[PDB]
UniProtKB/Swiss-Prot annotation, chain A:
Subcellular location field: Cytoplasm
InterPro entries: Ribosomal_eL31 (IPR000054), Ribosomal_eL31_CS (IPR020052), Ribosomal_eL31_dom_sf (IPR023621)
Description of how the protein assembles with itself and partners: Component of the large ribosomal subunit (LSU). Mature yeast ribosomes consist of a small (40S) and a large (60S) subunit. The 40S small subunit contains 1 molecule of ribosomal RNA (18S rRNA) and 33 different proteins (encoded by 57 genes). The large 60S subunit contains 3 rRNA molecules (25S, 5.8S and 5S rRNA) and 46 different proteins (encoded by 81 genes).
Note: There are 2 genes for eL31 in yeast.
GO CC field: cytosol; cytosolic large ribosomal subunit
Entry-linked Gene3D superfamilies: 3.10.440.10
Alphabetical keyword list: Cytoplasm, Ribonucleoprotein, Ribosomal protein
Record GO terms (molecular function): structural constituent of ribosome
Record-linked Pfam families: Ribosomal_L31e
Keyword Cytoplasm on entry: yes
The name this protein goes by in its record: Large ribosomal subunit protein eL31A
Gene Ontology process terms (BP): cytoplasmic translation; regulation of translational fidelity
UniProtKB/Swiss-Prot annotation, chain B:
Recorded superkingdom: Eukaryota
Family from the record: Belongs to the universal ribosomal protein uL3 family.
Annotated function: Component of the ribosome, a large ribonucleoprotein complex responsible for the synthesis of proteins in the cell. The small ribosomal subunit (SSU) binds messenger RNAs (mRNAs) and translates the encoded message by selecting cognate aminoacyl-transfer RNA (tRNA) molecules. The large subunit (LSU) contains the ribosomal catalytic site termed the peptidyl transferase center (PTC), which catalyzes the formation of peptide bonds, thereby polymerizing the amino acids delivered by tRNAs into a polypeptide chain.
Other information: Present with 450 molecules/cell in log phase SD medium.
Residues included from the entire protein: 340 to 387 of 387
Stated name of the protein: Large ribosomal subunit protein uL3
Known partners and oligomeric status: Component of the large ribosomal subunit (LSU). Mature yeast ribosomes consist of a small (40S) and a large (60S) subunit. The 40S small subunit contains 1 molecule of ribosomal RNA (18S rRNA) and 33 different proteins (encoded by 57 genes). The large 60S subunit contains 3 rRNA molecules (25S, 5.8S and 5S rRNA) and 46 different proteins (encoded by 81 genes). uL3 forms together with ES39L one of the contact sites for the signal recognition particle that targets ribosomes to the endoplasmic reticulum membrane.
From Swiss-Prot, chain D:
Keywords (A to Z) from UniProt: Cytoplasm, Isopeptide bond, Phosphoprotein, Ribonucleoprotein, Ribosomal protein, Ubl conjugation
Protein name stated in the entry: Large ribosomal subunit protein uL22A
Species assigned in the record: Saccharomyces cerevisiae (strain ATCC 204508 / S288c)
Subunit structure: Component of the large ribosomal subunit (LSU). Mature yeast ribosomes consist of a small (40S) and a large (60S) subunit. The 40S small subunit contains 1 molecule of ribosomal RNA (18S rRNA) and 33 different proteins (encoded by 57 genes). The large 60S subunit contains 3 rRNA molecules (25S, 5.8S and 5S rRNA) and 46 different proteins (encoded by 81 genes). uL22 is associated with the polypeptide exit tunnel.
Coiled coil region boundaries: none
Superkingdom assignment: Eukaryota
BP GO terms, sorted: cleavage in ITS2 between 5.8S rRNA and LSU-rRNA of tricistronic rRNA transcript (SSU-rRNA, 5.8S rRNA, LSU-rRNA); cytoplasmic translation
Family statement: Belongs to the universal ribosomal protein uL22 family.
RNA sequence: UUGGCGGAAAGGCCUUGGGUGCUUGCUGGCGAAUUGCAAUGUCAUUUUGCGUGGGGAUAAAUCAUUUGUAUACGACUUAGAUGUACAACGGGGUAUUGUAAGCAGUAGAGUAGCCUUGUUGUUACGAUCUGCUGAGAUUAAGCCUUUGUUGUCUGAUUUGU
RNA sequence: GUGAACAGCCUCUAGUUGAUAGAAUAAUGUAGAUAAGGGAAGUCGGCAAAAUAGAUCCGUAACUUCGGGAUAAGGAUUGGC
RNA sequence: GAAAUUGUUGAAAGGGAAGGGCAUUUGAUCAGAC
């Protein structure tokens, strides 16, 4: 239905990966992004861009960046619609540093 | 309140404080007030 | 609320630290006023 | 079949502390609920007063495999398969009433007492 | 119906007034039979349900989500329908380390070249040094605070004297 | 490549990414560790662990079958430019 | 197409076993005799 909005978020992975096993840090950061998008968009299913997968794993299994800037977008579901008519699709954001930014809404064009 | 009366030569003592610690408990606190910290350190780059 | 440190002058005759400084540990309990709402009466019975 | 299984808060609904989510056993059952529903609708049944009136599970023949144990031993590694039956029925009203007459036998002393009450009041 | 008393588990006791039925206090009239020669010969109170007709009133709990003063799992303790509400961020404070990258310097053991033939001659290399710089980075994951930005707030099950 | 080294550690060619997974982080375990002051008082017993350790220079006892003991013991140094 | 063992429905009982004996109450069922 409505609310096809896309917004930019900063996620603090440092507070979420605190004290996690080293071989699990990058894999758990994957599950944190999906839980993060579900919270802010309410969608059960969350899809990650493969180039966002690179951003998490850029510095190995235990070198995840403290902060990531994300472009989370809610979109209509297609291709034999599942129970959820809306899904969240998450992009990385190319910035010099992800610290000090506030959540903003991206215009639709 | 206490259930009994105790003199005990220790419970009748009049306690008058002299100094209360207000340093940070979130680390090895060094200063008691933000004014004290500003005087010891001086001006910083955060300050204008 | 938490713990903190106090300095006060000990006063007990016959002690080595009489009229001399002692550093001391205290705990602070936060106590706003309590609102009285209701009252209950208790009869004294053979079963308590 | 609950010995030394874990506890969960979602058993409160049923008055139990041990409950579990048998995904394999669930999917088998709801595949047979679908089959019975199709069978009922092929029979002209309403499908709105349908309820599960009978469902039973009993043991199928075992399927055999082998386990290797320490000091050169072989032990059974078996499957416990299931046969499943279920029946869906239309719910109906009360069955019947007005049971048998149950003819009653009175002694002559009891019969006279009854007539004494009829004679004694309107 | 009037007025009291009783909290040990009072839940009952006493009392005022009127109405009503009976009265074996005394003297009369009618009825009983056939349950057949006895057969407990059925008269008590427990709970529940379905009906009427007459009043009375219009909730919560659990699951799911959430917190960590709790925790193996259960369990515990918080929060959530429009607000000194909750959350994600950002800001500030508090802490830890010890002075970031970049740029500049007539700093720098010295070496080599250049000619404009030195006299601070310049250039090339050069660990490190000085200044911007108690800077920069991290700061709740079980730290504190918030006039900022953004979002969220009606899904499931069950319970009745 | 480091390095005396077909050591140990990292990489190239080539080959794998195979061993049921998910969530939490109680006790007790297996494996790995660190501890103030003391320093074997523990224990049958220093069992286990710790300490020493490469290289260069200096120095090296008793005893001896004269070959050894010996790396005896015991000191110093170690980077970069 | 037995038993051990098992599911479903029905009935009943169950305060740290169960099962048994004598006797009877209660519930279910039943033959004979007329």
């Amino acid at each position: 239905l409505k609310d096809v909005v896309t917004r930019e978020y900063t996620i603090n992975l440092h507070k979420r990966l605190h004290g996690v096993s080293f071989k699990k840090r990058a894999p758990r950061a994957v599950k944190e992004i999906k839980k993060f998008a579900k919270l802010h968009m309410g969608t059960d299913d969350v899809r990650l861009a493969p180039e966002l997968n690179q951003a998490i794993w850029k510095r190995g299994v235990k070198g995840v960046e403290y902060r990531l800037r994300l472009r989370i977008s809610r979109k209509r579901n297609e291709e034999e619609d599942a129970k959820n008519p809306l899904f969240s699709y998450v992009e990385p954001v190319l910035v010099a540093s992800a610290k000090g930014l506030q959540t903003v809404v991206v215009e639709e064009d | 309140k206490s259930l009994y009366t105790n003199t005990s030569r220790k419970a009748l003592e009049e306690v008058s404080l002299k100094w209360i610690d207000t340093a940070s408990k979130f680390g090895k606190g060094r200063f008691q007030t933000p004014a004290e910290k500003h005087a010891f350190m001086g001006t910083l780059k955060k300050d204008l | 609320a938490g713990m903190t440190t106090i300095v006060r002058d000990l006063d007990r005759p016959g002690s080595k630290f009489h009229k001399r400084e002692v550093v001391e540990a205290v705990t602070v309990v936060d106590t706003p006023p309590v609102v009285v709402v209701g009252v209950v009466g208790y009869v004294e019975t053979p079963r308590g | 079949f609950n010995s030394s299984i874990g506890r969960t808060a979602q058993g409160k609904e049923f008055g139990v502390t041990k409950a579990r989510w048998p995904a394999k056993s669930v999917k088998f059952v709801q595949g047979l609920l679908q089959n019975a529903a199709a069978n009922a609708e092929a029979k002209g049944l309403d499908a709105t007063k349908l309820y599960v009136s009978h469902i039973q599970v009993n043991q199928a023949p075992k399927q055999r495999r082998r386990t290797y144990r320490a000091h050169g031993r072989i032990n059974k590694y078996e499957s416990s398969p299931s046969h499943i039956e279920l029946v869906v029925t239309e719910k109906e009203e009360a069955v019947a009433k007005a049971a048998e007459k149950k003819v009653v036998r009175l002694t002559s002393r009891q019969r006279g007492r009854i007539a004494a009450q009829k004679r004694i009041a309107a």
